[PDB]
Symmetry: D2
């Protein structure tokens, strides 16, 4: 896994964030099991509860570009700092990457199964 590449593509993805309500831009990038890279950014709504996370955008991209399984994902804020997915996104990503999906972390990337142990499903 070229983490520098994934981090770069997530950082570039953060540029597209629609965040007029908090200004907290988030980008995400994932390697798919066919080698391709899909990306996404967050999209807020005036009704905060309808906001879509970057990682949710990544999973939409995954299925809109031929499906498959996610192998690795990096999520960053608009400054390029690595972020941990919210719990909603951990559940969403599990559906498409499983417990062995790697998630970027500033120290060492972690298995999703360790970030969401004994997951509902």
């Amino acid at each position: 896994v070229d983490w520098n590449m994934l981090r770069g593509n997530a950082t570039q993805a953060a540029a597209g964030a629609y965040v007029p309500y908090s200004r907290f831009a988030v980008g995400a990038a994932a390697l798919v099991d066919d080698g391709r890279v899909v990306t996404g950014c967050n999209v807020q709504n005036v009704s905060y509860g309808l906001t879509l996370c970057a990682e949710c955008a990544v999973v939409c991209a995954l299925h809109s570009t031929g499906g498959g399984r996610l192998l690795a994902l990096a999520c960053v804020d608009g400054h390029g700092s690595v972020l941990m997915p919210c719990g909603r996104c951990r559940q969403v990503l599990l559906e498409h990457g499983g417990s062995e999906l790697l998630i970027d972390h500033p120290v060492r990337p972690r298995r999703l199964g360790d970030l969401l142990p004994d997951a509902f499903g």
Copy 2:
């Protein structure tokens, strides 16, 4: 100015991407953005049903991943290519990115989002 045949067809193709193991109700959507490009989405269900993403939500994500802009028209269809009206959540999400004048495909005549979501919270 909108090629609805093109949009409805693209939405129809988009629906084959749907991840819908729980209901098997595929949905695809396609929209024309104000620079002339078309973006598509399909729905993506989750084992926790409440984390399911609509096709129209996927469209809005694709919008912002591909340069942003404003939506001018959108078509939403099921797996059989039958035109669908967006759910209330998608009406509100779409209003954020195309406003009241966003046109929504409809079997008889496209409708303004403003008429599908009047007196919108904002």
Copy 3:
């Protein structure tokens, strides 16, 4: 429908709002078909997309206190001003009140079916 009563109970409900991220408190109150009144307030989350609307809280209350159908609902901000439900909530409320559910409005209360015409379902 005693709208003054429903507006009062919604206003009182707004006091419980958990809104550290925008400070926009919302309360809601509904008359159920057995005569009882259920209430709710909004609950934000650090991940904005996990925020729960007041009207969502009302529907949870409905089912946690014996189920039934909603006949009328009033939604107000923390100042007691009537608010129109977001689209997500219109879809949610439709499930439990139908097209004929009345929703408070400053001029005249409206049928939900008019606020969400040709609804998905």
Copy 4:
């Protein structure tokens, strides 16, 4: 200090309220708040699956409708009374109102929410 028998039973009773016509998978939840009261919730599905509310979300709504406070312990169960682990969304929602030390019922030994959602976004 937590009566888990009481919590699990209350969650079990709460699950009979569930609105679940699409999956028929009822869920009930009950939690002890820091003033000693117990709040309950059940899941509520929607025809647009993504608008489904979890029982744990219902609990957090009930928390704030009944005076607010902090959650100390929560039990979540299905319609048969079998203990369930919350979904990722509910883990994040619960973290907001009980923090890492919130205890989650489990068939062998209650777990800290911090262990079910480590390195949480915040």
